[PDB]
Amino acid sequence: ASMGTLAFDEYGRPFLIIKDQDRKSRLMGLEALKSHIMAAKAVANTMRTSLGPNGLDKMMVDKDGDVTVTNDGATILSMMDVDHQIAKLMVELSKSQDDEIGDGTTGVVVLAGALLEEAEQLLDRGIHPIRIADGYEQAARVAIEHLDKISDSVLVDIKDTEPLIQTAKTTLGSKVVNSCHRQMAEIAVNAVLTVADMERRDVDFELIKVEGKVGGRLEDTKLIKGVIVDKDFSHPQMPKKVEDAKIAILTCPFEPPKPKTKHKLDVTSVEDYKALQKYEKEKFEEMIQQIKETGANLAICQWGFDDEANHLLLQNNLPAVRWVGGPEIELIAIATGGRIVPRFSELTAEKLGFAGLVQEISFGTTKDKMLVIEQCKNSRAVTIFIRGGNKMIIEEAKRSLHDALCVIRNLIRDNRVVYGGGAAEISCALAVSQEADKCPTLEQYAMRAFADALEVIPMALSENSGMNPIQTMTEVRARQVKEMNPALGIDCLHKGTNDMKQQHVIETLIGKKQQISLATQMVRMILKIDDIRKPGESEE
Amino acid sequence: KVADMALHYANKYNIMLVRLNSKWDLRRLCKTVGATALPRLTPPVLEEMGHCDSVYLSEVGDTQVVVFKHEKEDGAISTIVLRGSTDNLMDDIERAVD
Amino acid sequence: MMPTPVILLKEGTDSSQGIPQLVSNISACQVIAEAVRTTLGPRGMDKLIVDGRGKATISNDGATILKLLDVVHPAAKTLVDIAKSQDAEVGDGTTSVTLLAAEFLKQVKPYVEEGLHPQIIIRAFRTATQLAVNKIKEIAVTVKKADKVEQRKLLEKCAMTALSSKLISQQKAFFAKMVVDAVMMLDDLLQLKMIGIKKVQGGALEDSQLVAGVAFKKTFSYAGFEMQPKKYHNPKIALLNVELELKAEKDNAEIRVHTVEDYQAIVDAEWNILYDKLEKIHHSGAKVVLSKLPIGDVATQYFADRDMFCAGRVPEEDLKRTMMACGGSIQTSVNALSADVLGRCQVFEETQIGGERYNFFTGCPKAKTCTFILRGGAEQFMEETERSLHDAIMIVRRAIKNDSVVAGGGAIEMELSKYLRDYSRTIPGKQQLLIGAYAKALEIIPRQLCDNAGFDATNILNKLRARHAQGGTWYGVDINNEDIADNFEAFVWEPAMVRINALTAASEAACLIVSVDETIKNPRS
Amino acid sequence: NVDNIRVCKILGSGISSSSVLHGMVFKKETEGDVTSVKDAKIAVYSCPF
């Protein structure tokens, strides 16, 4: 069942073919297919419990013992320490779904596991795996066409954000931050809408700064239409608050100039020493005067500065911040409307950014100070500040907010939506079932397997919520057939009704399309592999 | 080696560049073209300038080659281009050629 | 053996001689061949090979699988070498070469066992291969009209046939159209480096796109980059090889001053040098600036203040592709940025592509290059897609060089086998058995196709043999219909040079393996 | 002179495709943009360019 081949020739002479062939292993054909299907089924069964509002989290521990509690499927699979190649394929599929869409990272794994589970029985019945892959591909094509058919459009207009709020709430329902559901959804929607190119173009995520500080409450998470800075004012006696601040962003340290080229300044007499000292003093005074002449109120530097410049800034009523990072410098320049100036000689009034309020914020008994640059005129950059009772919920809130921002970005890219809760899956399964009847017999089995695999999402949602899976799914499917309504799903929250359109369970159409496409492609790729050659060396 | 500015100004004046690392190849090229290996960047005098019927960049199989080709049925150096489906076979053919 | 007090060779020198070592070599070649048999035809499968570091690779290509196999048998390595040769010269048929060579060796194995002189077998292989190559050249179908639509259809059908064995076979029409369009843009040499292939994780296979221009990933922008506009409607592109940073003038430059005024003058001179370079670039009229060398934050902010776009550390091949698409010149100096050295494209845009930022140059009318953007759910998925596209690209290039095609699916193998048997019936008889064995070995390809597809190989081969004998040249295996069909009318088209090189390489490898009588292995140093 | 006969080994097309070229072949590429000259006037420099 392994070790490749071992014959040692029919003449008794040594028969060595592959280097270290006696320590290697190989699997061929149906055995390899069954092993792949088993590994994928194990991964999908582990992941399926974290689906829906009633889904549960996984506590992940890395090498150094650090602990992350999360429900995000992509994070769970990324931190999971797998060795099986098919498990790595599942992890990479989840990462791909995260990259392209940002949501649905758990549904793809469950769908792929269900598809391979059905393919197991299909193979046992004696069907070539390529036939199964082709049937899966064409069933997925039919399902995607049906998804396009049953989709609905929403308004992405700034004046009315209610559909966007509902979509973000549906995304955040499964996360732990549902205790502040509407607030978190609304801040995510406002963040995405603020930093976005209007004409259906990209939403650039470097304009969104996500910061998490321990303490306070999760409800204290707020949207700052500006920049939060880990730094504070350089001089301890500088004022802690500036109103109507005229910012002066600089990337030159407030130090005497220094040529980049290798250089040496020769001092040959006492007059040279006096001239050098006067030059240093006058350079400090001149740079301070040049900063002051523009009428600026706050000076922001990137590379820090020394004591004389600090005291001169304090003496001239010029609050300043040093050692600000490059990304933070760019964000401040974008938000305040100012220009980054490389040296004082080029500093003018028109290059000054304006901020309504610059404040230093304390965090209780921690000595830790952070700076707020908010109340900008037309800030094109936004920042999200997250609080919590421990760092773990802070990280989970960070990734939940990332999911919400990704979903709103997808909505901006394409405004067509479908109603979740398994309604879309049930409708796609019904469409595939109707298509299978007209198809010739051979591909009917593949199409029916695809439909049954699609039916796993409502089953998982119902089982996670305590309801009986098969009975609930069958009843919902019968209702969908009886009255034409592709919006009937699994009432996970027990609100009384099954109509997800009324319950405002909304998902992006492109998210579902990407889910089905990626699952089908990965399932085909796994089904096409019929041979493994591991080193089998058990190395350390 | 070829400097970046030198390559720029050579490209500006439509000049083909070949960089032979091995001194043996340079000597053989001097033999087969008739040029003299100058030790400075001085422009070549008439006698030191080499001549050839055609120089071009070509691909044989999957390897890019630079060919110095004489149309005349003469020259100091002639080359045999050996093709084959195996390196060992070409080595054996080279031994037969020797 | 009598132990001599002083032995001839070193200790541990192993030597195998005679018929048994030849039979062992044939068996080793069979062992190598059976490791790639299942990867043949539209019903072929993929192999998953894990290296020592645990980085698995998945491929349907015979050459890749053989390379990833650590073959150490000296006779078996010939099959890997001929697979590499077929990949290099043609790019497709890397599996057929190995199966054909191994089948030749297997067919002549019984005669080797009974003491037949190997030189006779070698001569028979040479004669049969010469005859088969001549027959292929004679019966290959060529279109002597130079029609644009017909020649494009020939290219597309050849690409489809070369692609209908991989995981992208479901989108084979789409990918073949893209590949043909990509190849037709290359000017005269059809260099591979002029066809960029970018792999972006995430997305469906149908989301793959071919850009009539050049695209590449964003390369570590500095601070102040986000204030540069990311869309231009008629930009002029300044392709540069320049480091736009404040730095030492040279690595061996030393500045010696003895006055503070000279110190200030030196600092201002450095700033003025940088600003002079930047001002020359700006006054050149360009809006997009690309450099192979890094572009500093000062230059980035300078260009942002002028509503210009900059990007440093752009890879050299990407700059070459941009030059070919837009028609500029990579300037190492900015002293003469004339209008004829600036690239020009209709639209430049930076967009989000599956979690990454890519710069797009589109609308180039004189572009001699193109870039593939492949989407997939895994790194190995996109790598196998790239390998399949490479196979299709090489096939299309070879078809561009000469449009001579033969029907695939084993039709050519059946025709050659029938011709070789007909020839073998008319020779004295010692060569007859060997030539008949060659003809029978030629039947391996359709038999392996039927075995991979799950057919009954014997019945299909019988029907194919009867059809070829009774009349019909292009009849081969029809996978979907579980039967045989005219493969020429089914558009199973492959270039004639594919089969020509396959037969030549397989024959050369078989002759080389047969000609060996002893193997001497010195102890490892 | 024996050394005046050079051998270039290029894999791919079988030994029957071998040919004799009156010149030399280098398995390398060109540094610049020009890739073909019809009336070459080679100037050889042993010093770095």
Ligand SMILES: Nc1ncnc2c1ncn2[C@@H]1O[C@H](COP(=O)(O)OP(=O)(O)O)[C@@H](O)[C@H]1O
């Ligand atoms: N309020 C709700 N009622 C019913 N189903 C819901 C509700 N909110 C989310 N779901 C379903 O839960 C499933 C899982 O969503 P979620 O866990 O947020 O992300 P992922 O799809 O990555 O698991 C979705 O397919 C969605 O249809």
Ligand SMILES: Nc1ncnc2c1ncn2[C@@H]1O[C@H](COP(=O)(O)OP(=O)(O)O)[C@@H](O)[C@H]1O
């Ligand atoms: N649609 C098809 N129907 C029948 N045979 C095909 C078809 N497409 C390809 N083949 C056959 O499959 C064989 C193998 O092709 P492929 O696996 O793509 O590359 P390789 O020749 O390297 O194995 C070819 O000889 C060709 O004749």
Ligand SMILES: [Mg+2]
């Ligand atoms: Mg979700």
Ligand SMILES: [Mg+2]
């Ligand atoms: Mg092929």
